Design a protein around this ligand. Structure first.
Ligand SMILES: Cc1cc2nc3c(=O)[nH]c(=O)nc-3n(C[C@H](O)[C@H](O)[C@H](O)COP(=O)(O)OP(=O)(O)OC[C@H]3O[C@@H](n4cnc5c(N)ncnc54)[C@H](O)[C@@H]3O)c2cc1C
Ligand SMILES: Cc1cc2nc3c(=O)[nH]c(=O)nc-3n(C[C@H](O)[C@H](O)[C@H](O)COP(=O)(O)OP(=O)(O)OC[C@H]3O[C@@H](n4cnc5c(N)ncnc54)[C@H](O)[C@@H]3O)c2cc1C
Ligand SMILES: NC(=O)c1ccc[n+]([C@@H]2O[C@H](COP(=O)([O-])OP(=O)(O)OC[C@H]3O[C@@H](n4cnc5c(N)ncnc54)[C@H](OP(=O)(O)O)[C@@H]3O)[C@@H](O)[C@H]2O)c1
Ligand SMILES: NC(=O)c1ccc[n+]([C@@H]2O[C@H](COP(=O)([O-])OP(=O)(O)OC[C@H]3O[C@@H](n4cnc5c(N)ncnc54)[C@H](OP(=O)(O)O)[C@@H]3O)[C@@H](O)[C@H]2O)c1
Lengths: 321, 317
């Protein structure tokens, strides 16, 4: 609003959990779920989520984020579907503008004594042909999230060069019949340990200089990905192979462009906060859910969002006189 | 018997077991017939359930999910554990003799035995538990049965003052019953307390009897307190009571094998589940002290599950 108590940025699970706790505490939090730069939590793209506690028969990420939003709005979180353009973490009240409403002379869209960050760190997508067709119907980015799906059990699994690829491929090896790793360039970017225990792992091969040209599959309602046209890049040699599952592993892009140094970041881009909390490099502003790069999960993000809400309340208690 | 990774405890422990069994391991989960959300009647503070879910139903859903993904859930208490050898030895309750054999040893082990808030065993506590009584205010604060109504809190530590200053955001008048003449809390916490408008502190007073509606689904209405110095008991209008004394962490089975803090909780590398001993992880309320929440507990359990998967992968290669 004109001046709120606390503002949370992002549509993610962390943001909605923090908003649940903050609206429970009667703190009147505002939540900016944006207009990805997806609509709703970045988890909505997942067709079904079975690794979240409390849902033994799985649950669609779309309706799960819808339920979290309904919880937040029921508790009193004023959620507005607007993207945040610019932040001003310099004045004592944190001011934030809206995309297409930004301006050096334009008044801020919302100011608050504290701001929680859960803008998400969505894994990069290759925007391949067929990706928008078989998205989460055989094409994913987290192996710990879609590895146990029966459509990948004892089936050829292909993964596109950082360590984020091997950490998931040596795990997918516990399901598919043959896991193959497609590297854009010869050799492995990852440190020597994962490459050593990966090339020596018997259920996974590493095809260097090979990138997937296109993603082929069925063409029916909820059609599954069946094959992958991959192109060896030293001979321009295109070749279509059996691939029931494709897993993206290019480096995740955390949405930390708003801070631009107001809060301080790491080399990979993520927001640096104290371990096990949400206290950023600056008081008042806390980041949760952006927070993690080693686990990259929605339950951990929800826990860190609860953490951010609790620490936000703890801080608001001290600021009030 | 022998398994991949053993998980001690009954939400984070279930979350760790879900993630372990999903990764196609052999994770034995020990609920124990032993030695907490199921005590909670209704839970609105959990995400994804806007209309709320009972703690018993939530834990039953988590349990059937875990046993669906492939965890050998065994309703047996773990008594003693010998973390000396490279494989970790465990022992069942009443089956933990010094010469007795380990029930289900494993290579790695997750700890999520929780940290239970101390109860008072007052007359009627069992009768009116979670129908007015509770232990976490952040969990049962915004419940409509407490808003704009008298609330009484028992405790002497900083947690009691924090819970009272949190509950002042709903009830008409919050009262705290210190068992002694002075506050065990810090000076800043006590200053923010006594300066908080809606809180009232009564020293040398312990709640003696919880007296509410003995209706088939009755709530709590009144509380017989007593000035512990004089012994003069007095029954006051208490719509909602809150245990806010210290919490007992069920780490007793570790017994110094893993480094512990002064309050008893298992120390961990911040932001992780790693313990002092490399190979055993601790998650949930055992390693969490500032939050005590079930969602944060399940998050820490997922942390422990992923780090144990990584550790058991790095061990055999
Ligand atoms: C294909 C894929 C599949 C996955 N499957 C699973 C799974 O099955 N189970 C699981 O637990 N995890 C899964 N994950 C992990 C997923 O990223 C989780 O959502 C993440 O761990 C937690 O999300 P978050 O809290 O970081 O916020 P996010 O979910 O990433 O929320 C991002 C939101 O931030 C908003 N935003 C960004 N910038 C702004 C801004 N300036 N102003 C306003 N809003 C902004 C965007 O609108 C976007 O909606 C998957 C990830 C990917 C890429
Ligand atoms: C009245 C009350 C209300 C609450 N309401 C909420 C709420 O609304 N929302 C929320 O998020 N949190 C709530 N909580 C917090 C609650 O305690 C959470 O469930 C807690 O944070 C989770 O703890 P845990 O996962 O670490 O272990 P828990 O699952 O809570 O308990 C660990 C289990 O380990 C078992 N165990 C111990 N030793 C052994 C052994 N040797 N062998 C086998 N098993 C053993 C014990 O039987 C115990 O049940 C509430 C707590 C209380 C007291
Ligand atoms: O380690 P990290 O993963 O966390 O961060 P990271 O360094 O960004 O890892 C990215 C990896 O993916 C590769 N990559 C980048 N864009 C790609 C694309 N369109 N298609 C296929 N591969 C691509 C890169 O190949 P390169 O090895 O050529 O950089 C690199 O190895
Ligand atoms: O964590 P933390 O902040 O809670 O630290 P903590 O030191 O564990 O505080 C626990 C509080 O519980 C109080 N307590 C113990 N038994 C009680 C009883 N029967 N009735 C009322 N209060 C009791 C204690 O009061 P005392 O200060 O009298 O020990 C103590 O201050």
């Amino acid at each position: 609003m004109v001046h709120t108590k606390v503002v949370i940025i992002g549509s993610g699970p962390a943001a909605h959990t923090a908003a649940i706790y903050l609206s429970r505490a009667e703190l009147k939090p505002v939540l900016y779920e944006g207009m990805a730069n997806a609509a709703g939590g970045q988890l909505t793209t997942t067709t079904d989520i079975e690794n979240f506690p409390g849902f033994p028969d799985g649950i669609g990420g779309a309706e799960l984020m819808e339920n979290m939003r309904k919880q937040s709005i029921r508790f009193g979180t004023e959620v507005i579907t607007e993207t945040i353009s610019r932040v001003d973490l310099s004045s004592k009240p944190f001011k934030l503008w809206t995309e297409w409403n930004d301006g050096p002379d334009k008044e801020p869209a919302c100011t608050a004594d504290a701001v929680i960050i859960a803008t998400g760190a969505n894994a990069r997508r290759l925007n391949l042909p067929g990706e928008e067709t078989y998205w989460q119907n055989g094409i994913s980015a987290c192996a710990v999230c879609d590895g146990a799906v029966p459509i990948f059990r004892n089936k050829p699994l292909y993964v596109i060069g950082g360590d984020s690829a091997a950490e998931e491929a040596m795990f997918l090896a516990k399901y598919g019949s043959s896991v193959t790793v497609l590297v854009r360039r010869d050799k492995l970017r990852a440190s020597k340990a994962m490459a050593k225990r990966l090339l020596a792992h018997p259920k996974v091969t590493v095809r260097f200089n090979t990138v997937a040209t296109e993603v082929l599959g069925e063409k029916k309602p909820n059609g599954l990905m069946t094959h992958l046209r991959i192109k060896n890049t030293v001979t321009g040699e295109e070749e279509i192979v059996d691939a029931n599952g494709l897993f993206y592993a290019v480096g995740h892009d955390p949405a930390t462009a708003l801070v631009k140094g107001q809060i301080d970041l790491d080399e990979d881009g993520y927001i640096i906060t104290k371990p096990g909390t949400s206290y950023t490099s600056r008081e008042g502003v806390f980041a949760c859910g952006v927070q993690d790069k080693r686990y990259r999960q929605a339950i951990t993000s929800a826990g860190s969002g609860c953490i951010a809400a609790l620490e936000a309340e703890k801080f608001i208690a001290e600021a009030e006189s």
